[PDB]
Structure 1
Amino acid sequence: SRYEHIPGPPVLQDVFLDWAKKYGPVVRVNVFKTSVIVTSPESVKKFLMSTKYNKDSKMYRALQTVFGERLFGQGLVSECNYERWHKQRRVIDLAFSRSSLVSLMETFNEKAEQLVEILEAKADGQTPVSMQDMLTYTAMDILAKAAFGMETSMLLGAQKPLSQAVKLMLEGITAKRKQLREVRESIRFLRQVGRDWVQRRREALKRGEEVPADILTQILKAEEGAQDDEGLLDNFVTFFIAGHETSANHLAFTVMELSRQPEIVARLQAEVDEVIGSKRYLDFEDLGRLQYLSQVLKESLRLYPPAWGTFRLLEEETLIDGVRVPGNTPLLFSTYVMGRMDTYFEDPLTFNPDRFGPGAPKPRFTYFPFSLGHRSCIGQQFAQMEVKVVMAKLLQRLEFRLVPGQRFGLQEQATLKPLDPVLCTLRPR
C-alpha cells in the first residue's frame, strides 16, 4: 500500500483511541477507504485553523446520500467546495446573530417549562422515564419552532411517524431488503416534510402573514437563482437533523453522567437556586451567571462529544509529526480521542468541571466539540443557550436517579449517543 509505511495495526472511536495511544499522533485506519487519524495539537491547529484545507467530500459521502436517497446532499455541513460553502454560510450567519439568538429565549423557556411540567407529574420516585427520549422531544420541539416556525408538539406525543423516520435514517448511515426500504422511505419522508413546511412559509408570505425572520428565511434567500429546490431541501434536512440531534444527546449524556455525581449536582442546584431563584423564566443575562453549569457542560463535551470530529483533505504529500503522509489523503480529527488521552488530559476518565474553571489553563487545540476554524459549528451559541436553559430548569425543579441496570456506554452512528435510553426515576426538589 501507499499507506503501509505509516504506523498502525499490522465503539469505533474507542478503537481509534487505543490505536492513537499504541501508535502515536499519526495512525492509518479504515473508515468506510483508508484515512489517517491525527492527534497532535500542532496538527489540529495547522489543519483546522487554515482556509487552505477543505473538508474531504469522499468522507462526507455517507451523509450526502444514503442507499441512493439524497440526505444532507450539498447543504452547509456536507458541501466541500469552498466558494459554494462560503456563499451559503455568510447568508445563513444572519439567523445566528446576537439579536436573533436573544429573541429565541422565549422559545427555549416555553419548551423547557413544558418538559419540566411533564416530568414533575411523573416525579413519584418509581415511574421509569427515558430522559433520552424526553430530551430529544424537547430539542426537536425547540428546533421546529425556532428554526422553521412550526409546532411539532412531540412533548405532547405528536409526530411519532416523524420520530420513527429520524430513528430509521440514523441507523441507515452506519449500515436486509426490508431495512433497505424503511431507510429510503424515511429519508424521502423527511424531504417531503421539508417541501411541506416550505410551501406553508411561501403561502404565508404570499398571503402576508407575520413571518418571523428565522433560519428558514435565510436558507430560502441562499437559493435565489437555483433551477430547483434541491439545495434548499438539503439545508432543510441538514438543519432539521443537526439542530436537534446533538443537542438532545449532549443533554442526555450530561444527565446520565450527573446521576453518579451527587456532589456536583448539589453544587449545580445551589448555583441555580442563587441566580434564578424560584423564577420560571431565565433572562438572557442569567445565562452568563451560571458559570459552574457552564463548566459542567464543557466537561460533558470533553468525555461525551456527540459530534466526534471532522475530516480535511490533505492535497499534497506532507510531513506530519515526523510521518510522511501521501497526497490525496483524508485526515481524521477526533475530539473524542484527544479528550481521553492522558497526554492531553490528566486522569482523562475523571469527570472534573474544574478543568474549565476561570484561571485553569485553557485546552490548547485538544478540545473541539464544535470543531474549530471556518467550518466550526454555526449553531454553537444556539446549542449552548438552549442546553443551558433546559439543564437549569431541570436542576431548579427535579431530582434524578438512574434506574439501576442503565449502562454508561456509548453507541456510534454518525454521532455518539447513550447506548441506553437514560431511564431515570424522579422526585421534586
Structure 2
Amino acid sequence: SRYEHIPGPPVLQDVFLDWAKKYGPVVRVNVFHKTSVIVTSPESVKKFLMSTKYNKDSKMYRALQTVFGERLFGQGLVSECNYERWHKQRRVIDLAFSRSSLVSLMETFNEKAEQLVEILEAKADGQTPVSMQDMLTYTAMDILAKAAFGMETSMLLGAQKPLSQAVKLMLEGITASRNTFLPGKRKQLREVRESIRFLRQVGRDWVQRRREALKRGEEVPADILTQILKAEEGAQDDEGLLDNFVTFFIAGHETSANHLAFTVMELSRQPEIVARLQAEVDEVIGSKRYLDFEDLGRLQYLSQVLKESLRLYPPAWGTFRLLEEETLIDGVRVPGNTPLLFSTYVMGRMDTYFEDPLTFNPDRFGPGAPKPRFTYFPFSLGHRSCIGQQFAQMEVKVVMAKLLQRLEFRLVPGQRFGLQEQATLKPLDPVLCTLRPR
C-alpha cells in the first residue's frame, strides 16, 4: 500500500522498458522479490549516482553476497554497501588499476588474444561451427586469471573444466536465488552450494601459493591480488580476502566476456561497419602481431562501435541506491527506505534519449557528436562506478582488434540476436559462427 500511488501496471528489463515508456520516469516494479522504483530521468541519474550521500541498497545485492546459505562475494568490492567499509577497500585496490599498472598488462592481453586467434584460424574453413560465446569466455577467464592473480587457467587449451563448471553453476545459483520438482530442488542446491565452496577453495589454495612464494623470496609481480591482500592486512580471518578473490575472479571476466560476445553477435549483421573496422585495424596496426598501448587510442572507430554495443547490450544493466528519506522524484512522492533502480539498458532503448534507439549506429559516439548526458552508463557513474572500466576497455579492444585483423565471421543461420538475463545480460544463443581467414 505504501507504493500503490506510484505510477505503474495495474528479459524482465524489456518489460521495465515498456512500463517506463507507458508510465513515465518513476515507476513501481517488483524485482528480486522486492518492491522497487525504476527511475529513468537523466536528472535523477545525476542526482543519485553522482553523490556519496546515496549508497547501494544491500537488500538488492543479497544474491551476490550469499547463495543457498553459501558465502559468495560476501562483503567484497561490488556487494559491500556500507560507504566507509567500501571506501577503505576501494582506495587500496585502486592502486592495481593505475595507468602504470594497466600499461604493464598489455603483454597478457596480447598473448591471450593471439592464442585465441590462432585456435580460431585453424577452424576457419567456412563450415565448422564455433561458439564465439564459449571461446570469448575462455579468453576472458585466461586473461583475468593471469593479469589479476598470476595464475594460468589455460581454459583456451581445454584445461580446468571443473572450474568452468563451478562458475556456470554459481551463476545459475545467483539467477535461481533472484527468481524461482523436489528432486529438481535437491540436486540444484547440492551442485550450486558445492560450486561456491569450490570457488572459495580455489581462492584459499592460490592465496596460500602466493604467501609461500613471497616467503621463499620468489619473484611476484604486483597485481590485483597484491592489493586484495594489502586491504586485509591485520584482519581477524581470511573471509574478506576470499570475498574479494571471488569477486574479482568472476567480475573480472564475466561482463567482459558478455560484452565481447554481444559485439561479435551484432557485428555479424553489420557487414559495412565490419569492413570499416577491418580497414582501421589494417591502417593502425598493419601486420604487427602485438598492439602497443599507444595503438589503442588510435582505434577510434572501434572505440565507438564498442560504446554502441554497450548502449544496446550492457552486461550489467544497472544499479540500485537506497532512498533513506521520503523524496519527490520527477513529481512523484517516493517513500523512504525504497530501493531506486537505475537502468542503462532501459534508457538506452528509449526514443526520448536516443533517436531510432534500436538502430546500431557507432556515429552516436563520434568526435563531433553531442555526448549522452546521464542517459548512458554501462560502467555506472559516480563513486560506485566500475573499478575495472579501463582494464575492460583495453582488453576488449585488444581482443577485437586481433579478431578483425585476421578473421571473417558469419553467424550460423538460425542463431538468434536475443538476450537472456542470468546473473548478467548475455546472448541467448552461443554465437555460433563459421570463420574464414581474411
User: TM tier, shorter chain?
Assistant: over 0.9
Structure 2 CA distance for aligned equivalents of residues 292 and 427 of structure 1: 23
Structure 1 CA distance for aligned equivalents of residues 415 and 84 of structure 2: 46
Q: Which residue of 2 aligns with 1:260?
A: 269
Range moving further from structure 2, 28-37 or 261-270 = 28-37
Structure 2 CA distance for aligned equivalents of residues 166 and 346 of structure 1: 38
CA offsets, 1:240-271, max 9 Å, x none?
00000000010000000000000000000000
How much identity, in percent, do the aligned residues show? 100
Structure 2 CA distance for aligned equivalents of residues 199 and 13 of structure 1: 42
CA offsets, 1:353-384, max 9 Å, x none?
00000010000000000000000000000000
Structure 2 CA distance for aligned equivalents of residues 428 and 174 of structure 1: 38
SS in 2 for 1:143: helix
Gaps of 5+ in 2: 177-184
Q: Which residue of 2 aligns with 1:239?
A: 248
Structure 1 CA distance for aligned equivalents of residues 198 and 4 of structure 2: 44
Q: Which residue of 1 aligns with 2:366?
A: 357
RMSD of aligned alpha carbons: 0.4
Range moving further from structure 2, 406-415 or 329-338 = 406-415
CA offsets, 1:148-198, max 9 Å, x none?
000000000001111101111111112111111110000000000000110
SS in 2 for 1:260: coil
Structure 2 CA distance for aligned equivalents of residues 280 and 406 of structure 1: 31
Matched, 1:418 2:427: yes
SS in 2 for 1:310: strand
Shift of 1:414: 2.2
Runs of 4+ in 1 over 6 A off after TM superposition: none
Q: Which residue of 2 aligns with 1:36?
A: 37
SS in 1 for 2:250: helix
Structure 2 CA distance for aligned equivalents of residues 62 and 122 of structure 1: 39
Structure 1 CA distance for aligned equivalents of residues 297 and 28 of structure 2: 42
Structure 1 CA distance for aligned equivalents of residues 198 and 417 of structure 2: 33
CA offsets, 1:137-157, max 9 Å, x none?
000000000000000000000
Structure 2 CA distance for aligned equivalents of residues 327 and 150 of structure 1: 46
CA offsets, 1:268-292, max 9 Å, x none?
0000000000100000000000000
Structure 2 CA distance for aligned equivalents of residues 18 and 194 of structure 1: 42
Structure 2 CA distance for aligned equivalents of residues 320 and 351 of structure 1: 31
Shift of 1:90: 0.1
Structure 1 CA distance for aligned equivalents of residues 418 and 168 of structure 2: 19
Could you state the TM-score of these two structures normalised by the residue count of structure 2?
Answer: 0.98
CA offsets, 1:318-373, max 9 Å, x none?
00000000000000000000000000000000000000000100000000000000
SS in 2 for 1:170: helix
SS in 1 for 2:252: helix
CA offsets, 1:215-235, max 9 Å, x none?
000000000121100000000
2:278 aligns with one of 255, 269, 289: 269
Structure 2 CA distance for aligned equivalents of residues 123 and 362 of structure 1: 39
Q: Which residue of 1 aligns with 2:8?
A: 8
Structure 1 CA distance for aligned equivalents of residues 16 and 216 of structure 2: 54
SS in 2 for 1:208: coil
Q: Which residue of 2 aligns with 1:27?
A: 27
Shift of 1:413: 1.4
Structure 1 CA distance for aligned equivalents of residues 61 and 418 of structure 2: 26
SS in 1 for 2:253: helix
Q: Which residue of 1 aligns with 2:391?
A: 382
Shift of 1:62: 1.2
CA offsets, 1:7-27, max 9 Å, x none?
011101111101101110000
Could you state the TM-score of these two structures normalised by the residue count of structure 1?
Answer: 1.00
Structure 2 CA distance for aligned equivalents of residues 72 and 35 of structure 1: 23
Structure 2 CA distance for aligned equivalents of residues 211 and 315 of structure 1: 45
